[PDB]
Ligand binder design. Structure first.
Ligand SMILES: OC[C@H]1O[C@@H](OC[C@H]2O[C@H](O)[C@H](O)[C@@H](O)[C@@H]2O)[C@H](O)[C@@H](O)[C@@H]1O
Ligand SMILES: OC[C@H]1O[C@@H](O)[C@H](O)[C@@H](O)[C@@H]1O
Ligand SMILES: OC[C@H]1O[C@@H](O)[C@H](O)[C@@H](O)[C@@H]1O
Ligand SMILES: OC[C@H]1O[C@@H](O)[C@H](O)[C@@H](O)[C@@H]1O
Ligand SMILES: OC[C@H]1O[C@H](O)[C@H](O)[C@@H](O)[C@@H]1O
Ligand SMILES: [Mg+2]
Ligand SMILES: [Mg+2]
Lengths: 724, 724
């Protein structure tokens, strides 16, 4: 409907209707929910919610199904005075019912299209079940794998995260201005604004601190990218940003988000984060929490009652302008309007059961393909992999049969529909003997059984990993290791003298030196999702060729953290020259390098890259165009991820030794050759200076071209002269 | 001499003379040295230093003795045109030849007078050997035990570090305006400006990043307090501060140091830190390193050649003002003048041999007292300690006979003058049997010998520890554990069925949980210095009663770092009333609490504390007077550390749950009672807001009074009304 009628609606609302519009509740707080209705009475009572609140609430979070949505919207619209429908929002993080790999795994694909397709399918299914908005993408830069939420991020690189964040928004939303017409797409909500992944000691919800320059340089760029790509909502972070909880941080949300980033959509709090500013010690009570959060521009309070119980009195007493309330309501109404809810409050569902669009075979094939793009081959000594389909396999370990392969943040998918490693393996390999072990134990009985199976077969697929519950939100591990019984199992298996592949399932970087050294191959599957078993079986048989690269460094040990490729040089770098000398930047007990670096992964193919002649000089403002010719020189078809880095050798700020500025995943048949070309704009050479200005300075840059952050060729370009 | 004559000197020096005055060299680069003359040739060659440079250099660093000094000074004055004597600087960190406990142990004393006396004796002796300046105190806040240099700090608390810093300045310098007459006092040099102990991942020299607010709040106050108390010099830090190497950080050194802190003495570089700005990637070559460091106001280049090889070109080409050089040179001459060097270049030594003032018995007694103040009793089950003088002791481990107990940053002290554990114990205990073991090994033959000594004896003193080379500068450990052999030794000893006291020697917090569980008593001696085994024997026997408290938290495990008492609350604090809820700030695998908290230490005595009735309300700017009555209620004379903390419950910035604001160690005979009073000025209730203003806000504060950061009674004070 027309903008004018949207405006009119706001004019017509009472003050109480306006306040309620800024409240979001679980489905079972509303009349006509078809699930958990026994909870309704007591919680309404605990939260001191009346019908006058629930009949005017702005939004539903976490509806269980189309029929939950429909019953709630129907009952709600019966009693709503002006007919403003509810907006329904959900956590669709890496799939709805067809579960794709965890976002950290998606990061490892280095494949924009893989990520878009993931998001497209997620929206196809989520819309089919009544959801209008997804709390995705999560764009928090991560350097600390102790934090359970690394699984939701695409990793340690701001550029990769930006690029995949855009892909995700494009997949969920399609053309953002046609969300009223395209009812299989949904609104995206960027999260968590901002810097949440810098949680101190990887402890959930803990303190975040960094200089403002760093915040701009590395922590804000992906949120910005996704916002500039049309992301419709943004969500607050639980953490302080420089001393002030993000939810009430006016500078952060008014000056930066709404001001500099020109975001004009709904700002939703993370769960309870409006009330939680009290806990943080920056509000004395719910009245202050409400006032400060409204001041900061938060439109929608998620499952707490500060606004609902406090705004009226604040406005009447002149401590808050009703104008700020009107701006929030308008933002909420426009989102509803963008989603087409004023013409159709059931968003396509009403005469049209879309059950059939959920968990199709086509969709499953897409999740499988994503899993195969995303896995990372870390070790393959003497071409153990791929296995011949006649290979006789001992399949041992906690991940041999565990159905827990869908990943954390899997709110709607069901393990009943997943494919476990055994089932997947038996579809490919004729001879499989299985010995399941527990996640945290290794008994003498297990050892006996494991030895019998290994003696019978030719190769060992040792399937290890994490329960998903050991990560995700409030899954913080102080030590980034598997249960010790699993490292023991790997030691034991190695003594039986048969070749061993370790297939590892997990949500975070782990200490894997001991695994790499106890096995001949190591394949990192992360949590691939619904098709986990077949993803595993196709990579192992070579039906698919591993092509993933690490989007986050794998530390030598927990104590090395944070370790990350785009690090500063220091005043005393360790060189190949000065190595062994005491007075340089080093540890006494480990190397400086992570165990596996950013951009690293193996293939069953072999590849050859050559960069075309580059200019020696460039003007300021001028682009560098990089041409790379890549050949597959093997008999095996595969993909390689070409990566281009830039270094700023000397600057007014100490700059990282490398930064990713372009990448493209290239498919080549055996002997096939291609040429890809990259443009590094003058923005790629620029950075934030000590006055917070975004600047390009003349001087030397290095350009690195290759297939990891460490396997590269290096060129020099001197920028100076005049400005384009 | 009179200031005009000092200004006359600046006016008469040639440009080359002024440049060279800003250079500092090792002693053997000068004619007249009496040690290491074989290094002189090649190093002059490598550094391209001529006679014209060395005959006009400003300063000597690390003279080897009074003779080295006299020879160098005397030859230098023969040839120096205007008669400007050399200033001699050295690292006197926790003692000269009488070695006192490492500064981190001195933090655990909580005793300002111990710290002043340590500095006083250090100056007595160092001046006796011809040193004019010491590179102490080290005032870097530390929260990360991986970093080797925690040994040089007094710990994780700004207030403690501020107070002991002033004590140290006071002890080295006495009345600063009389350093020209008090020739047994010497100048102090605060280091390292600024924030060096925040090195990322505990790695030597690594990146530091925090917000400007946080820098002011926690990282700057100790440097500030030492400077306000009159510290004559300041030294730059190796690390970046918000992206810019401290050495060439104009804002830091001109605006904050010289501007806000009003510091008008000599700014000396860390070792090589001027040239190293090149490696940091913020200067392209020595000419730039020279220009930027001089712009930032560094007066004295430590052992690199940027200034001497480049300043003439920079001044001649007018890229740098000669006035900046004249003010550096005037600062250098003012220091020399302040030390009385223009009346007496030999600073009291020329016809006065002061060997007699070195390593006196009185000084050894002071070092022993300091050791027994600083040690921390961590466990003492069933009153194992103190031992009877007739207890039969098996003394086992790598620290049983080891002479390495002087500590890191011991540049002049000698192991042969130190007292080891065995020697200390045999002065007190009639029956000791000793089995020495290696630091990193546990052999079968060791176990047999340990078993034999233990079977014979009644109790075991298990002496474990680090070698001092495993910390100090560029002694970073990713895992903060002893060698595994030592844990294995503790495990083994425990099986022998005799009571065990572990005496631990070390330069950092370590993972001691396994040691606490493997023994009946655990005594943290850190490294006590010259009197190490007498410190150890007096504490174990009861002749002294342990009184030290941790000034740094002891983590559960490496992966809990950073963990510190003065932490923020977060939005989702774990409370005793949400035990076991998933969605709160916690780890899955360890407690949130450190294994041992700040302010913790046991005693052979028992004390009771009673806080006098406090006001319920206070005005802004008003002090709070806190009166505490303490009684020793046991039969054993002993000392306790009364600690007062403050919390700002609600603020415009999220404030720590507690901060220490007063402390006093109280000595009490059996049954004796004392009252002490503390004034918490309004400065104690103030903080840096998001605008970087030092503010006091009206509102609620809590006052905690007790004997650790966790053993406290709590009171409430509402601040407001009018101001003063
Ligand atoms: O850390 C041991 C593992 O190292 C992998 O190589 C990764 C990366 O290491 C350096 O940066 C090299 O310069 C670069 O060429 C490498 O790609 C090995 O491939 C693993 O087998 C090792 O386990
Ligand atoms: O209680 C707070 C927490 O509640 C849970 O029910 C939600 O899923 C969490 O994501 C939320 O952060
Ligand atoms: O090479 C540089 C290093 O050499 C040693 O002689 C110094 O005492 C160190 O503190 C210095 O940082
Ligand atoms: O953290 C565990 C420790 O807590 C301390 O406060 C106790 O004094 C110790 O005996 C105990 O080992
Ligand atoms: O040895 C002189 C100085 O060398 C280095 O600059 C160290 O950082 C410093 O702590 C020491 O005082
Ligand atoms: Mg540059
Ligand atoms: Mg307050």
């Amino acid at each position: 409907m027309e903008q004018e009628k949207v405006q009119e609606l706001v004019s017509q609302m009472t003050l109480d209707e306006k306040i309620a519009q800024c409240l979001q509740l679980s489905p079972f707080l509303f009349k006509g929910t078809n699930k958990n209705a026994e909870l309704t009475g007591p919680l309404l009572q605990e939260m001191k919610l009346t019908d006058a609140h629930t009949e005017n609430a702005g939004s539903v979070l976490g509806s269980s199904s189309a029929l939950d949505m429909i019953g709630i919207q129907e009952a709600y619209l019966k009693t709503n005075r002006l007919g403003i429908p509810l907006v329904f929002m959900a956590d669709v993080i890496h799939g709805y019912k067809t579960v794709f790999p965890i976002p950290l795994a998606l990061g490892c694909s280095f494949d924009r299209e893989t990520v878009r397709v993931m998001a497209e399918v997620s929206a196809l299914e989520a819309t089919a079940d009544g959801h209008h908005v997804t709390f995705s993408p999560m764009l928090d830069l991560v350097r600390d794998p102790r934090w359970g939420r690394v699984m939701e991020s695409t990793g340690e690189d701001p550029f990769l995260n930006s690029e995949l964040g855009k892909a995700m928004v494009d997949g969920y939303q399609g053309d953002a201005s046609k969300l009223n017409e395209n009812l299989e797409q949904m609104a995206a909500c960027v999260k968590h604004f901002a810097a949440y992944g810098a949680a101190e000691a990887g402890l959930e919800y803990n303190t975040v601190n960094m200089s403002t320059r760093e915040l701009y340089q590395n922590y804000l760029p992906a949120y910005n990218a996704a916002i500039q790509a049309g992301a419709k909502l943004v969500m607050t972070a639980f953490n302080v940003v420089d001393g002030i909880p993000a939810t009430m941080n006016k500078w952060l949300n008014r000056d930066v988000l709404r001001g500099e980033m020109e975001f004009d959509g709904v700002l939703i709090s993370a769960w309870g984060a409006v009330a939680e500013v009290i806990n943080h010690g920056t509000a004395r009570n719910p009245k202050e929490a409400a006032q400060f959060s409204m001041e900061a521009g938060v439109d929608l309070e998620m499952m707490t009652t500060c606004y609902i119980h406090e705004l009226k009195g604040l406005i009447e007493e002149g401590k808050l302008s009703e104008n700020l309330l009107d701006e929030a309501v308008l933002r909420m109404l426009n989102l509803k309007n963008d989603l087409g809810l004023f013409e159709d409050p059931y968003r396509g569902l009403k005469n049209n059961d879309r059950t059939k669009d959920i968990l199709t075979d086509e969709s499953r094939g897409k999740a499988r393909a994503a899993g195969v793009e995303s896995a990372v081959l870390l070790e393959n000594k003497s071409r153990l992999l791929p296995l011949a389909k006649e290979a006789k396999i001992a399949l041992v370990g906690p991940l041999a049969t565990s159905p827990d392969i869908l990943g954390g943040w899997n709110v709607y998918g069901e393990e009943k529909d997943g494919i476990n490693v055994e089932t997947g393996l038996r579809e490919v390999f004729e001879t499989v003997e299985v010995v399941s072990t527990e996640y945290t134990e290794l008994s003498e009985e297990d050892k006996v059984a494991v030895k019998a199976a290994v003696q019978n077969m030719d190769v060992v697929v040792l399937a290890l990993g994490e329960k998903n519950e050991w990560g995700g939100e409030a899954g913080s591990l102080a030590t980034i290791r598997l249960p010790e019984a699993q490292y023991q199992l790997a030691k034991f298996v190695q003594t039986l003298g048969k070749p061993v592949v370790i297939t590892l399932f997990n949500g975070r970087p782990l200490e894997v030196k001991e695994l790499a050294e106890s096995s001949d191959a190591l394949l990192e599957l992360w949590f691939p999702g619904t098709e986990a078993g077949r993803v595993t079986a196709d990579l192992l048989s070579g039906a698919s060729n591993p092509s993933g690269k690490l989007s986050m460094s794998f530390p030598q040990t927990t104590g090395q953290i944070p370790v990350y490729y785009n690090h500063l040089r220091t005043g005393r770098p360790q060189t190949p020259e000065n190595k062994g000398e005491r007075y340089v930047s080093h540890y006494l007990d480990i190397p400086n390098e992570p165990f596996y670096p950013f951009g690293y992964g193996k293939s069953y193919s072999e590849f050859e890259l050559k960069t075309s002649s580059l200019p020696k000089e460039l003007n300021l403002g001028e682009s560098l165009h990089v041409e790379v010719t890549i050949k597959n020189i093997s008999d095996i078809a595969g993909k390689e991820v070409i990566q281009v880095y830039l270094q700023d050798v000397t600057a007014s700020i100490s700059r990282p030794v490398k930064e990713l500025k372009a990448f493209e995943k290239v498919a080549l048949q055996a002997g096939e050759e291609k040429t890809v070309t990259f443009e590094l704009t003058s923005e790629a050479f620029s950075f934030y200076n000590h006055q917070l200005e975004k600047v390009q300075e003349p001087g030397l840059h290095r350009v690195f071209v290759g297939t990891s952050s460490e396997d590269v060729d290096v060129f020099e370009v001197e920028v100076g002269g005049y400005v384009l």
